[PDB]
Amino acid sequence: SPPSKEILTLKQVQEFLKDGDDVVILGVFQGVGDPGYLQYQDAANTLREDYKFHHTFSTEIAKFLKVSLGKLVLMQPEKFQSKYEPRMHVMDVQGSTEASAIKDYVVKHALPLVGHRKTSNDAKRYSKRPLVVVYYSVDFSFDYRTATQFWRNKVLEVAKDFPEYTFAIADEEDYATEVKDLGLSESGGDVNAAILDESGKKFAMEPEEFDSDALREFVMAFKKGKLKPVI
């Protein structure tokens, strides 16, 4: 069946940005016979197990999104946006556009600078290494999202300086046994950090009052090969 699903209303797109937990991938095309749309559906079909795809032919939605027709638009939900990232990544797509280039752009741009690594998404989203993980109580509900973003903001400050590594926040309970195994379950701190490297080794951050500086030092020490792995 059709890999990409049609978006009928502006409210649908608003709900994705507000409620979503994953990259919003949107093909914006002139209509169902648009050669660019067909190339998009080819790309989407290939990636269908790993991402959800949407499309629209609405000039109303294109206007809202501030794009002309014939584009692939990737946006993150509000909870994953930041001062350092554009609200949209936009790629020109026409009949001549290779499906492999579409597929490449989606993979390239599907992760935010600091996303939420979950036991449900870590294989499909957080496979790239090195990966810097920041562990704490992650809760995007109305009552707890300010505090969650408080800490996410400290991570984003470091992440923007190390584009060569992937950074994510992770819930400490969700990853209880990963945290124990990192030797971090004892620590008296509400926030902890680890690095997973390309070889399969893991490095735990010396528990300290958590701030961007301390996180930046840990990543720098990692980069410089000054850390020893957990066993």
Side-chain angles (χ1 to χ4, degrees):
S1 263
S4 176
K5 202 163 190 184
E6 193 178 1
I7 284 197
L8 312 170
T9 63
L10 228 200
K11 282 193 179 180
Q12 180 83 340
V13 182
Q14 294 170 322
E15 171 182 80
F16 287 169
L17 296 165
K18 280 54 145 189
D19 285 6
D21 84 330
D22 209 1
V23 62
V24 179
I25 304 167
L26 187 58
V28 180
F29 295 105
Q30 305 188 227
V32 68
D34 186 345
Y37 169 65
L38 294 182
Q39 284 306 97
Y40 175 68
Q41 281 284 23
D42 192 328
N45 176 60
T46 294
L47 293 175
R48 75 190 302 145
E49 296 184 47
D50 304 324
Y51 304 93
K52 296 273 106 171
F53 291 86
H54 304 268
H55 64 271
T56 186
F57 313 121
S58 173
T59 59
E60 156 182 307
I61 297 185
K63 300 180 187 161
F64 171 83
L65 295 180
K66 300 205 142 190
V67 301
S68 51
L69 299 172
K71 309 285 179 205
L72 189 233
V73 176
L74 265 80
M75 295 175 282
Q76 294 291 341
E78 287 205 349
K79 62 170 63 63
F80 304 133
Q81 289 170 358
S82 78
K83 317 175 292 201
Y84 306 118
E85 301 161 82
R87 298 265 180 102
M88 32 191 103
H89 279 97
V90 180
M91 179 184 62
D92 298 351
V93 177
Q94 48 215 244
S96 66
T97 313
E98 285 201 33
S100 60
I102 297 173
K103 167 174 4 162
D104 285 359
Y105 193 85
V106 171
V107 174
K108 177 166 178 188
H109 290 111
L111 280 183
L113 223 200
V114 182
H116 180 189
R117 173 187 180 246
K118 288 192 277 206
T119 54
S120 65
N121 80 16
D122 58 21
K124 260 175 194 151
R125 288 295 146 99
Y126 286 102
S127 239
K128 196 167 185 182
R129 306 273 177 280
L131 166 68
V132 179
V133 186
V134 175
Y135 303 93
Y136 62 100
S137 175
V138 173
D139 182 345
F140 291 102
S141 71
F142 185 76
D143 284 343
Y144 295 91
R145 63 190 191 194
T146 295
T148 295
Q149 289 297 0
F150 174 82
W151 293 113
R152 196 188 150 252
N153 283 161
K154 291 186 162 12
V155 188
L156 277 163
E157 296 294 313
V158 183
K160 65 154 156 54
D161 284 340
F162 297 90
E164 65 266 24
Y165 308 140
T166 308
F167 288 70
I169 64 171
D171 182 68
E172 55 190 353
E173 276 212 26
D174 195 17
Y175 286 95
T177 154
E178 184 170 82
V179 170
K180 183 181 291 81
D181 295 351
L182 293 165
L184 288 176
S185 202
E186 80 314 316
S187 78
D190 289 22
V191 186
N192 286 284
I195 300 182
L196 321 197
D197 80 1
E198 238 139 347
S199 309
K201 310 208 175 201
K202 293 142 191 302
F203 308 87
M205 184 181 113
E206 179 90 326
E208 187 208 301
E209 272 164 283
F210 195 86
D211 60 20
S212 290
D213 289 336
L215 182 65
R216 208 218 158 96
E217 299 182 330
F218 175 58
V219 172
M220 269 299 179
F222 168 77
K223 180 179 234 23
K224 282 185 223 142
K226 283 155 65 154
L227 302 182
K228 283 321 175 63
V230 195
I231 313 163

